[PDB]
A = this chain, B = another copy of it.
Amino acid sequence: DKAYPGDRRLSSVMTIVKSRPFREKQGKILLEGRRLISDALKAGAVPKMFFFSRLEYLKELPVDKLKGVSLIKVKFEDIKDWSDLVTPQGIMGIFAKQHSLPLLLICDNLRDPGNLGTILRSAAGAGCSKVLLTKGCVDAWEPKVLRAGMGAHFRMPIINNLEWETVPNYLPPDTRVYVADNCGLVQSYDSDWTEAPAAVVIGGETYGVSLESLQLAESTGGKRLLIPVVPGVDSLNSAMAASILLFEGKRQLRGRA
């Protein structure tokens, strides 16, 4: 049991959760939540340690979820300091850090946890079968990221170790790469992203899309797709644009044009 919040294991867990460079150097990530831990175990992640507070250890179901991993009882203050959320999740796991016509979405550059979680929830709603993002230092099990995903981020098939370099290699198949920007006009609904496979590349809201990716989208047989802005606002949120693009693709794959 861990009652003292100043324990070295608790300090190491807090350093790993708070710092993504610590997660990259230690090769370990922390996922808070019994449902999140179950989704990680089902997705193929191998847990190395299980953290159970005074509430989830009494359940003994999360103790069954360790599957041989190290289980340590945690006090309330230890759980509160260790978890990056205001509400500490009772069950946590410290682990080692496509279908036909699949929807592949590539998120370049740095992205906020709220925007990433909203994009994950919208993609789960639409039913995207492939997600590529930045390199391995980005953790989708962060409390802001996990809370923003509403459990859909743990439930979606997203690759967090894709990186900007191997994403063209991971999407070198027969998928038309398209650039989504306000200066792209073809239109978003005027694309063949549903009748054939699509590898959608979208930049950050405040980070933008790279010019090389925009050139490569035209190079990869696709065309630049723009959203017609009837209003006076030049750009909306990137998550809303991704949700609209996923909805248009799902509608056009559901028999629309």
Contact = CB atoms under 8 A, between A and B. Distances in A.
Contacts of A235: 39
Interface in A217-245: 227-237, 239-241, 243-244
A233 B127 CA distance: 10
B233 A42 contact: yes
B251 A125 contact: no
A239 B122 CA distance: 9
Contacts of A121: 233, 236-237, 240
Contacts of A124: 229, 231, 233, 236
A12 to B, nearest CB: 28
A252 B121 CA distance: 23
A231 B118 contact: no
Given A42-B233, A152-B236, A256 B254 contact: no
Nearest to A236: B125
A233 B122 contact: no
Contact of A42 (B43, B152, B234, B236): B234
Nearest to A152: B233
A248 to B, nearest CB: 6
A256 B253 CA distance: 12
A247 interface: yes
Contacts of A156: 231
A39 B229 CA distance: 13
Given A227-B125, A231-B124, A233-B151, A118 B43 contact: no
A114 B39 CA distance: 20
A206 B243 CA distance: 21
- Residue of A148, A189, A228, A244 with most partner-chain B CB within 10 A: A244
A127 B239 contact: no
A35 interface: yes
A126 interface: yes
B239 A118 contact: yes
A122 B256 contact: no
A97 interface: no
Contacts of A248: 247, 251
A244 B256 CA distance: 14
